[PDB]
Each structure stands twice: as C-alpha cells, then as structure tokens.
Amino acid sequence: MVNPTVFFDIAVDGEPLGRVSFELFADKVPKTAENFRALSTGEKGFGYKGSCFHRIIPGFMCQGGDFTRHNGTGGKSIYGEKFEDENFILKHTGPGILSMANAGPNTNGSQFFICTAKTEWLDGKHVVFGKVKEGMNIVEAMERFGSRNGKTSKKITIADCGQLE
Ligand SMILES: NC(=O)c1ccc(N)c(N)c1
To answer: According to the UniProt entry, where is the signal peptide?
Structure first.
C-alpha cells in the first residue's frame, strides 16, 4: 500500500554530516523503486553502503550509486547490468527529485541523482522515481562540496543506508 522510505547517512571525509530520507514512488514506478530500495538495504548482497557521490554540481544535481567503478562508469541493477526505462509519468519539477542516471535509452543500472534545481530538459529521458522526504538541508550541505565541473572538494560518502518503518 504505502510507498517505502529509505535513508542515507552521509559523511564528509569520514565525518558524519546528517541523514537524508526519500519517499520511493512504488505506486507509479514499482520496478525502479524496488531496485533503489533493495540497493539501499543491501539485501541482494550488493548496493549503496560505502559508495560516494562522485559528481556534485551546485545549482544542478548530486550524482551517486556507482559501487563497481566509483566514478560514473559502473554500477548494476538487481535485475542484471541494465534495465529498461519503466515509464516517464513523473517529471523533474524542482529540488529534491530523485531520478535515474543513464547512458542512453533503456540503460538504467544503480546510478541516480538528486536534483538541486528544476531540470525539465531531462523529462522523458530519465526515469523519476522518488523525492527527498527529510534532510534537504543535508543535501544542500553536500552540494557545497561540489564544483562547476562536478569534482568534489571532500569525499562525500553513504556511511550507512537502509529502509525506514
Ligand atoms: N555515463 C556512463 O557511462 C553511465 C551512466 C549511467 C549508467 N548507469 C552507466 N552504466 C554508465
């Protein structure tokens, strides 16, 4: 019934920062929401714990989820290396939207991004599947460690993650 909620405990060069929680829209995009949920608990034997936000651009997005190559070239889903664009019902409306990164049509894996601005040009190209629930302040603090080209000035990690309730 109820959309699941997941959390990320963020650290900055190993130092705890705070918690970000997300609502996952399992009601509209169940296959995409289930992938992010399972990667957040680690219940398939792999996932987001210990991974980093490798590309942060202030006024745009924070991108993470590459737990196999640590730099934007890797990751895998719970369904195999890649899976299809499930639907484009939800749009990139503003800060806090959670959406899938990709390298072309039907190439979703584990990488994702949190919007820090409206990114409407991505509508119909990236699958939106959730939003920040609590901790947008923590996202804003992360965002300050980014740069124009995306390289971070300190290492931004998911020290822990899982499901709430
Ligand atoms: N830019 C890339 O090479 C890339 C982005 C998203 C993905 N999910 C994968 N697998 C690769």
So the answer is: none
Beta strands 61-64 and 97-100, pairing class: unpaired
> How many residues in total does the chain contain?
165
Specify whether the CB–CB gap between 57 and 147 falls below 8 A: yes
Catalytic residue, chosen from 54, 55, 67, 98, is 55
Place of tokens 């990488």: 111
Q: Structural domains in the chain? A: 1-165 (2.40.100.10)
Tokens of 134: 């609590």
Q: Which atom of ligand 1 is nearest to the CA of 74?
A: 10
Q: Are 113 and 92 in contact (CB under 8 A)?
A: no
| Distance set, CA 106 to CA 20, 84, 101, 124 (Å) | 28, 4, 11, 12
Asked if residue 28 lies in contact with residue 90, where contact means CB atoms within 8 angstroms, the answer is yes
CA distance 159 to 142: 14
SS3 for 115-150 is: ECCCCHHHCCCCCEEEEECCCHHHHHHHHCCCCCCC
